[PDB]
């Protein structure tokens, strides 16, 4: 097998409803199924198959282990996966490794799986290449070492993964692991606005740069934007200048005064946001997704912007459609690309969490929208699940 | 892999009971299975495997989501599939895409999947090639854009699919998409009797023509018959002249006065009908299926006719056997062909719907009859399912 | 792929307990499984995989369709299969075709499946080659056309299958279909003692002959023995002369007076019996299995005999071991051969039916014994299933 | 395919938590799953896939066959397996053969499966190569012939397996079968301290020697250590001299007086212990695991020792970490190696038995730790299962 490289996107000018994976439409006390309790789903694709990954609490619905399924880190959590299209049940899934934070990507020949686990003050990034545990990385800030919760990106056998370490309420300077065949051959230290960068959604803007729309949990509702050079292996970060803030919670659009680099009010918190590229010979399409509600993880909107510099462009992004309405859950979103015969199809996935509190199960559905054809985005996604059943 | 082309049918002069897929013989409240609630099943075959496709309501039996499973369009519906022979349960199936109307065919190298979804007045045909969403088509009449609910037909890498748009009670002029590797390379506008044509069952009459027995829902109990030229890429439609009307409901045979083109009384309504070819060097066998009851979807009969012109032949078709008796359900029927080592085996499938009203689940069984050996058709198919369990 | 031919057996001088497939150890009302209700199991092997075939009543345990699962012929029955080693549940199995009598064999390139179905007075043998229905054969005596319920045997692409037609209480002259790539290229009419021959268990005695130990249901407790010539394509039948009668019920051993050809008392009834060959350069080992109880299908014994002529040898067979004790069920038995790297391993399977009457489910377990190593047969098989659960 | 040979271990200096397979986190009376009741799990890897083997009591949870699932030998037990990562449910697993003691290994081309079964005083080792039963071996001491309960080791197509026969409370002289393509081509009689050696965990110390840390059930808390020469095909056994006794129960470390060969008090009993190698060009790392509690199978500790002679080195092993705390079960442990692209990854598995007495089910979880990266062992494994559900 030969190495994967980003190619031109397939042509299209709009995203449409592609696929909904609602595992819990089969979790009734009356039904006879075993969908796993999961969270932080993401899709990664190899040249031949796409895979629906997720972090399971090692429990099913119906079941008797709902207690604690709303908390994120523990000794039971595992990175699991199914072929995209398959329902993630107890028997359908493959357990890759113990992890309460993960990532995965296909280098063209084999699958690389990233799972972080261990004690908060000394967590560990573990790397698996296919069936073999090949390497690990240690906590540097000693405050919950974590990773992307979305696909890593490989080019010519070299895969780049964002990791971060630090306080959720303070400073978390991220790093980038350059992995090759399962072993870390390099650690990239980004430059610029480094005070807080987590849950980066990365993709190839070209064969020279990898860009990530990330999450700042302590200082702003603006998403830190990473420009990583795959030739010089150097990264530099700074805020997306756009009026259309993509974090949640956030203030009114255009609400933040000052130059591009202004944080504005902290707006304590954030969320992982969808972001994927549309590469054309002439232009670059940057697709973003963000919650409909400014304060809550309800709904999901699609935005596009062709060309410009995310760092210096104060202009608003263009609304491209409602993927999820305000009455449906809109939690984490990510980007991924399906590999078609000659070109790449960009897609955005939306984690639709079923929240009913700490005193009941807590799992998620995954909605998929991909670039296809033209015109306007036509329909939205509902999970269809009734938590009382 | 090299492209698929229609070949001569394998020899035989009769159809026999081949296979019954009754998923709900395992849906008892007492059992431990999860058969999906489906409707509009159809079978399509590649050079190596056949597949049982269907439109699921994203629900199982036993389960708690039976409400609404009798209606056809919604945001939960999906085109799913299993290898033919497998029971379509929650774990066995693969979810291809969101669709409340579909179609699928194998071009010799890859699977093409068609799923239509979106709002009634602006629905959308979406095309998937293997794992990639490759193209889409828009509503032209702005009244529920829909498709076949049966296999599309490929020849040399070119696949033809019938789509229609319009009122069920009025005019619905159908169109034909010429698809290649997932992208629409052409849109064919048929000539002739174009006022209403839906749910076309198409097949190859030869390497030059594709014929479809279709459904007219507003004006007649006679089935519109399409003759599509694969070399000039032009279609022309007009009513089957035969005395033996194949739609449901319909009047007594021979009941309609006038020339071949007479509609007769509207007989509001219709049904998708089975139709498949038997190609011989010398002759063409055209196999049709139609409900036993004239007014209700109960029972299913097999009919044959060798040669002639469906458009100008007023003669009765020859009764070839009772596949389903009047006491068993006989809903949609379709044609498909299994690819044997040197020749093609024509088959007719019958959707056997379990109807018990809107206040209980609504799913279907699929009976298969294929050309094999000679003599007369020997036995019928019962679903064996008791809806009370 | 190149054609299969019988090779020399692997060396050994004894059979040992190999594998037990007890699907109903998982059918408790308390459990969460769906083992299929089956009967008439048999194993057939290709060059690479063996398969556990059976005739399902299209029902599971626990379930609500036990009524009628004790009767043998109906419109719901199907020939199904799983990889040998897999439990035959609703999801594990593949439904091949509708059949209330079957057979199957691998010709070295593809699977051939035989299923007989239709009305008793006009049943039909249907042949499937891989995915394609390729041919059929008709009732000649017009009294339940049936077949082997065990593997057919292929040599150089030619597969021989025994079929029989007629009364169970009278005459049933069997025939032999020579099948090639799914189509009957010849019908062999046996010579000799032809009055009653059913459920023949056949195997290769060499590359020239196929021998079957069969069942006479009307006239004797002696098993009709078939010697079929694969070069001249002619068969001839006559009773096994041995003192050790292998049918059930039967009288005391040596009980029947007269020459080899004497029927003795009718002993109305019979059973399919295990029979497999052990080919050595110098000698031929013939392995037989028969119930421990003379009148009931309880227990199973193993017998061997090297060389001689089954037709003229009045000598007793040698007891080789108790595979099943008198307190466990011992119903149908068959032979099959696993293909090892250079040689063939002969095995005998025993259908262990769970009978509790007509007012509860009726299914079976399958025990496997194969030639391996030397010494004496060491342990027996119990199903372990409690029918009350 | 070409034969497997041991290669250099991948680099690393520590073990980390890799994967937990807790099948019973899905066995609730409320859930809808069927995890098998198992014991004596072990992992073996081929060049491309690893497999989770185990000895099932042919029963599931929830189910109604818990009675007797705490005893080890019977006619229902079977050696089963799933791909490592898959949950061992009724449908996921493959039943290889009837065995109440087993072993398995991949020679580079095919799977070899060892299962011992039969009556205690005349048990039998049966060998299966892929699908074929190829050979068997007999009881020599006529007291429960048994084997490893962990992977056998192949080199150049030759696989070595330890078997033992004898009293658990007295003498059990072990033997070593040299197997090739399923048939025993040689029986090795070890020299030295031969009075009691069972459940040997073996691995390749190099291409010349296979070393096993084994179990002495009658005379000491010191583990018998086997040095087997693959070139001369001779074995020799004697006690590990180390202060750090690895059996359970055992006295305080350094507690046993006398020279390396002193037994000390019998400390009636024992346990299978984990042991795997870390081959470097220059040095050999020997990894051992042993229960945390001296008297009970609670907890599991990791120990290492580079170079030296296990037979003459009285020094303590180095504590390398707590894999399981004293409050969690720590039963059998074994070693295995995943084959990475160029090197081998050593791992230790821990069987975590769910014991609640004889009056409820008795099954196990399997925790995996593998060499990866450096630093110290970071986290422990909990099963997470509540036996009351
Ligand atoms: C901003 C990072 C915070 C705090 C550290 N982590 C976090 C937040 C959320 C959420 O719902 O916002 C879900 C999961 C996590 N996660 C954790 O708590 C550990 C890693 C993981 C992802 N960051 C995944 O479980
Ligand atoms: C004559 C077409 C009508 C009305 C538009 N559609 C329709 C009818 C029936 C039926 O039972 O007759 C089932 C499904 C549909 N379908 C729909 O309602 C949308 C497309 C689909 C097939 N035509 C499949 O769901
Ligand atoms: C001696 C043949 C008899 C009577 C015709 N058939 C028969 C007998 C038994 C039995 O338990 O003995 C089981 C199945 C059948 N079978 C049938 O009733 C139809 C074919 C099949 C096998 N002979 C399999 O279902
Ligand atoms: C020290 C060997 C003893 C006594 C013979 N056997 C034994 C002990 C234990 C245990 O929990 O210690 C489990 C299983 C067995 N086993 C048996 O009883 C038969 C073989 C097998 C492994 N030795 C596996 O079932």
For an interface test with A, the pick among D46, D62, D373, D388 (most A C-beta atoms closer than 10 Å) comes out as D373
CB D104 within 8 A of CB D45: no
E strand residue ranges, B167-233: 172-180, 183-188, 191-192, 198-204, 209-215, 224-229
Instruction: Check the annotation: does A337 bind a ligand.
Output: no
The residues, any chain, with a CB within 8 Å of residue C367's CB and separated by 6 or more, are: C17, C19, C20, C21, C300, C323, C324, C349, C350, C352, C381
Contact A95/D21, CB-based, under 8 Å? yes
Q: Is D77 exposed, middle or buried (0-12, 13-18, 19+ CB in 10 A)?
A: buried
Q: Give the whole-angstrom CA distance, residue A335 versus residue A211.
A: 12
Which protein residue's CA is at the shortest distance from atom 10 of ligand 1? A271
| DSSP state string for B349-368 | EEEEEE---SSS--EEEEEE
Q: Give the whole-angstrom CA distance, residue B136 versus residue B117.
A: 11
Mutate which of D69, D77, D146, D169 for ligand 4? The one with the most ligand atoms within 8 Å of its CB, which is D146
Whole-angstrom distance between the N-terminal and C-terminal Cα of chain C? 47
Contact D25/A119, CB-based, under 8 Å? no
Mutate which of B80, B118, B144, B146 for ligand 2? The one with the most ligand atoms within 8 Å of its CB, which is B146
Contact B384/C65, CB-based, under 8 Å? yes
Query: Chain B residues with CB inside 8 Å of C121's CB?
Result: none
- Ligand 4 in reach of D217 Cβ (< 6 A): yes
Where do the domains of chain D lie?
1-389
CB A361 within 8 A of CB A61: yes
For an interface test with D, the pick among C82, C342, C373 (most D C-beta atoms closer than 10 Å) comes out as C373
Q: Which of B217, B328, B326, B234 is nearest to B273 (CA)?
A: B217
Q: What is the DSSP letter of B375?
A: S
Which protein residue's CA is at the shortest distance from atom 8 of ligand 3? C72
Instruction: Check the annotation: does B247 bind a ligand.
Output: yes
Q: Give the whole-angstrom CA distance, residue B17 versus residue B199.
A: 25
Strands A191-192 and A234-239: parallel
Q: Give the whole-angstrom CA distance, residue A26 versus residue B235.
A: 44
Number of H helices, E strands in chain A: 0, 26
Q: Give the whole-angstrom CA distance, residue D292 versus residue D329.
A: 10
Query: Chain A residues with CB inside 8 Å of B33's CB?
Result: 32
SS3 call for D380: coil
CB B263 within 8 A of CB B257: no
**By CA distance, what is B375's nearest residue in C?**
C138
Residues D127/D129/D133/D139 CA torsion (nearest 10 deg): -10
Query: What atom of ligand 1 comes closest to residue A199's alpha carbon?
Result: 23
Distance from CA of D182 to the nearest CA of C (A): 10
Contact C33/D91, CB-based, under 8 Å? yes
Q: Which of A142, A284, A149, A265 is nearest to A227 (CA)?
A: A284
CB A143 within 8 A of CB A120: yes
CB D172 within 8 A of CB D164: yes
Which protein residue's CA is at the shortest distance from atom 7 of ligand 2? B72
Phi-psi region of D312 (alpha: psi -120 to 50; beta: other; left: phi over 0): alpha
Residues annotated within the binding site of D for substrate are: 39, 73, 198-199, 215, 297
Q: What is the largest CA-CA distance in chain B?
A: 57
> Catalytic: which of C113, C332, C344, C369?
C332
Chain A partners (3+ C-beta pairs within 8 A):
B, D
Query: Chain C residues with CB inside 8 Å of D136's CB?
Result: 16, 372-375
Contact A373/B124, CB-based, under 8 Å? yes
The verdict on A119 touching D (C-beta cutoff 8 Å) is yes
Residue B97, token pair as written in the block? 């895409």
Q: Give the whole-angstrom CA distance, residue B207 versus residue A228.
A: 54
The residues, any chain, with a CB within 8 Å of residue D287's CB and separated by 6 or more, are: D15, D274, D275, D276, D277, D278, D302, D303, D304, D320, D335, D346, D348, D371
Using omega within 30 degrees of 0 as the cis cutoff, is the peptide bond preceding A249 cis? yes
Which protein residue's CA is at the shortest distance from atom 25 of ligand 4? D72
Distance from CA of C383 to the nearest CA of B (A): 22
Q: Give the whole-angstrom CA distance, residue C57 versus residue C38.
A: 6
Q: What is the DSSP letter of B377?
A: -
Residue B240, token pair as written in the block? 């089957």
The domain defined by A1-389 carries CATH number 3.30.360.10: no
Which protein residue's CA is at the shortest distance from atom 9 of ligand 4? D72
Candidate from B29, B63, B94 with C-beta closest to A26? B63
Q: Give the whole-angstrom CA distance, residue B272 versus residue C48.
A: 43
Using omega within 30 degrees of 0 as the cis cutoff, is the peptide bond preceding B189 cis? no
| DSSP state string for A177-233 | EEEETTEEEEEE--EES-SB-EEEEEEESSSSEEEEEEE-SSS-SSPEEEEEETTTT
Closest ligand to the CA of A218: 1
Interface of B with A in 64-103 (CB under 8 A): 64-65, 75-76, 78, 90-91, 93-98
The verdict on D129 touching C (C-beta cutoff 8 Å) is yes
Count of CB contacts below 8 A, A vs D? 136
SS3 call for C26: helix
The residues, any chain, with a CB within 8 Å of residue D1's CB and separated by 6 or more, are: D47, D108, D109
CA atoms in the 13 A half-sphere facing the CB of D270: 28
> Catalytic: which of B58, B65, B72, B158?
B72
Closest ligand to the CA of A215: 1
Q: Is C72 a catalytic residue?
A: yes
Q: Give the whole-angstrom CA distance, residue B276 versus residue B335.
A: 5
Q: Which of B269, B219, B277 is nearest to B248 (CA)?
A: B269
Q: How far is CA D256 from the centre of its chain?
A: 26
Contact C372/D119, CB-based, under 8 Å? no
CB A134 within 8 A of CB A128: yes
Q: Edge to edge, what strands does the sheet with D101-106 contain? A: D101-106, D111-117, D124-129, D132-138
**By CA distance, what is B370's nearest residue in C?**
C133
Contact B34/A30, CB-based, under 8 Å? no
CA distance to B51, B251, C98, C146, C355, per residue, from C88 (Å): 21, 48, 17, 24, 19
Contact C381/D32, CB-based, under 8 Å? no
SS3 call for A348: strand
Q: Give the whole-angstrom CA distance, residue A161 versus residue A180.
A: 11
Q: Method of determination?
A: X-ray
CB-defined site of ligand 2, < 6 Å: B 40, 55, 72-73, 100-101, 144, 146, 149, 168, 198-199, 217
Residue B273, token pair as written in the block? 């009908």
Q: Give the whole-angstrom CA distance, residue D234 versus residue B2.
A: 58
Distance from CA of C137 to the nearest CA of B (A): 7
Q: Is A13 exposed, middle or buried (0-12, 13-18, 19+ CB in 10 A)?
A: middle
For an interface test with C, the pick among D131, D137, D177 (most C C-beta atoms closer than 10 Å) comes out as D131
Mutate which of C40, C68, C72 for ligand 3? The one with the most ligand atoms within 8 Å of its CB, which is C72
CB B382 within 8 A of CB B326: no
Distance from CA of C253 to the nearest CA of D (A): 30
Distance from CA of A344 to the nearest CA of B (A): 9
Phi-psi region of C199 (alpha: psi -120 to 50; beta: other; left: phi over 0): left
Query: Chain B residues with CB inside 8 Å of A18's CB?
Result: 97-98, 126, 133
Chain D partners (3+ C-beta pairs within 8 A):
A, C
Residues annotated within the binding site of D are: 39, 73, 198-199, 215-216, 220, 247, 269, 297
Q: Is D282 exposed, middle or buried (0-12, 13-18, 19+ CB in 10 A)?
A: exposed
Q: Give the whole-angstrom CA distance, residue C211 versus residue C202.
A: 5
DSSP bridge partners of A67: none
Residue B10, token pair as written in the block? 């394998």
Q: Give the whole-angstrom CA distance, residue A250 versus residue C182.
A: 69
Q: Give the whole-angstrom CA distance, residue B203 versus residue B184.
A: 19
Contact D136/C372, CB-based, under 8 Å? yes
Contact B375/C126, CB-based, under 8 Å? no
Q: Give the whole-angstrom CA distance, residue D336 versus residue B367.
A: 50
């Amino acid at each position: 097998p030969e190495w994967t490289y980003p190619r031109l996107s397939c042509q299209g000018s709009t995203f449409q409803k592609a696929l909904l994976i609602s595992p819990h439409r089969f979790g009734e006390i009356k039904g006879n199924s075993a969908p796993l309790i999961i969270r932080e789903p993401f899709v990664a694709c190899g040249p031949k198959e796409c895979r629906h990954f997720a972090l399971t609490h090692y429990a099913a619905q119906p079941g008797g282990y709902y207690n604690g399924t709303r908390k994120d880190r523990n000794k039971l959590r595992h990175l699991v996966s199914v072929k995209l299209g398959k329902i993630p049940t107890v028997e359908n899934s493959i357990f890759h490794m113990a992890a309460w934070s993960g990532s995965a990507c296909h280098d063209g020949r084999e699958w690389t799986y990233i799972g972080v686990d261990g004690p908060d003050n000394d967590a560990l990034v573990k790397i698996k290449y296919g069936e073999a545990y090949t390497d690990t990385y240690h906590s540097y800030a000693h405050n919950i070492l974590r990773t992307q919760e979305s696909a890593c990106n490989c080019i010519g056998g070299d895969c780049y993964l964002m990791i971060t370490d630090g306080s959720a309420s303070g400073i978390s300077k991220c790093r980038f692991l350059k992995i090759r065949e399962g072993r870390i051959i390099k650690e990239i230290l980004p430059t610029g606005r480094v005070e807080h960068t987590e849950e980066c959604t990365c993709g190839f803007a070209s064969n020279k740069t990898i860009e990530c729309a990330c999450r700042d949990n302590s200082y702003t509702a603006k998403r830190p934007f990473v420009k990583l050079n795959v030739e010089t292996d150097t990264a530099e970060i700074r805020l997306m200048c756009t009026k259309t803030y993509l974090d949640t919670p956030r203030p009114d659009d255009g609400s933040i005064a000052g130059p591009c680099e202004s944080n504005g009010d902290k707006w304590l918190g954030g969320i992982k946001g969808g972001f994927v590229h549309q590469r054309m010979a002439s232009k670059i399409g940057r697709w973003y997704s963000r919650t409909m509600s400014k304060t809550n993880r309800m709904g999901m909107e699609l935005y596009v912007r062709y060309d410009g510099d995310p760092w210096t462009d104060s202009d608003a992004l263009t609304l491209s459609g409602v993927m999820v309405s305000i009455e449906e859950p809109g939690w984490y979103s990510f980007g991924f690309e399906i590999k078609d015969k000659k070109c790449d199809v960009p897609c955005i996935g939306i984690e639709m969490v079923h929240d009913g509190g700490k005193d009941t199960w807590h799992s998620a559905a995954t909605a998929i929208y991909c670039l296809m054809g033209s015109g306007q985005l036509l329909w939205d996604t509902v999970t269809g699940v009734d938590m009382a059943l």
